[PDB]
Design a binder for this molecule. Structure first.
Ligand code: SAH
Length: 204
């Protein structure tokens, strides 16, 4: 995967930030209760890190569960949108997640719809950075879509064209891959098409 692809994908979300919620909210509505049940199940506690926080759809929920949230997104436009929620215990930071190495640790790491934007060749390095971010006894949870070209082309009507990574991975694929990377995982289809995963890092 090229930097061109990574930048294109990020640029798409920079362009979409102001209209993101109008699309995302009704998209997520049916699966939201099942996802929120797992989110509130007791692992999102203490100091929480969110990756690819977007408009703060999940950040709003994390803020209510955590003592403090650090929320990272590559788009300043997204961070600006996320500020609308007025969450007092959240620090937003602009960060390209493909350049990211943490300099502290958190009790829980959460991301929604992020992993499917991570191509196979960047998967291991991403999980190495996540591993470093997890405090002793910490946990990683995530939401994504299952599957039952690495990227899709999306062209806006003005002509802007983007490539966006779309690698939906099954519960079996995710469990197998994360096992291979030294994690223990439970990945469950909480609503048709939608997965919730809980992951614990092994000794290495
Ligand atoms: N290279 C990159 N580094 C950090 N964030 C990136 C990125 N490429 C895309 N993103 C962010 O990934 C998010 C994808 S959409 C998912 C947003 C949110 N988690 C939700 O579920 O609603 C966008 O907010 C986009 O800005």
């Amino acid at each position: 995967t090229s930097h061109g692809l990574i930048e294109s994908q990020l640029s798409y979300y920079r362009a979409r930030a102001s209209e993101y919620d109008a699309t995302f909210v009704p998209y997520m509505d049916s699966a939201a209760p099942a996802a929120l049940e797992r989110l509130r199940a007791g692992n999102i506690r203490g100091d929480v890190l969110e990756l690819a926080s977007g408009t703060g759809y999940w950040t709003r929920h994390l803020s209510g569960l955590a003592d403090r949230v650090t929320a990272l997104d590559g788009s300043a436009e997204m961070i600006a949108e996320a500020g609308r929620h007025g969450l007092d215990n959240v620090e937003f930071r602009q960060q390209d997640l493909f350049d990211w190495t943490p300099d502290r640790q958190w009790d829980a790491v959460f991301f929604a719809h992020w992993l499917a934007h991570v191509p196979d060749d960047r998967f291991e390095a991403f999980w190495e950075s996540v591993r470093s971010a997890v405090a002793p006894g910490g946990v990683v949870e995530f939401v994504d879509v299952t599957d039952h070209e690495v990227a899709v082309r999306r062209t806006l009507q003005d002509g802007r064209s983007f490539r966006i990574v779309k690698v939906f991975r099954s519960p079996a694929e995710l469990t197998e891959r994360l096992t291979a990377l030294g994690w223990s995982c439970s990945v469950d289809e909480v609503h048709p098409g939608f997965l919730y995963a809980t992951c614990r890092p092994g000794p290495r």
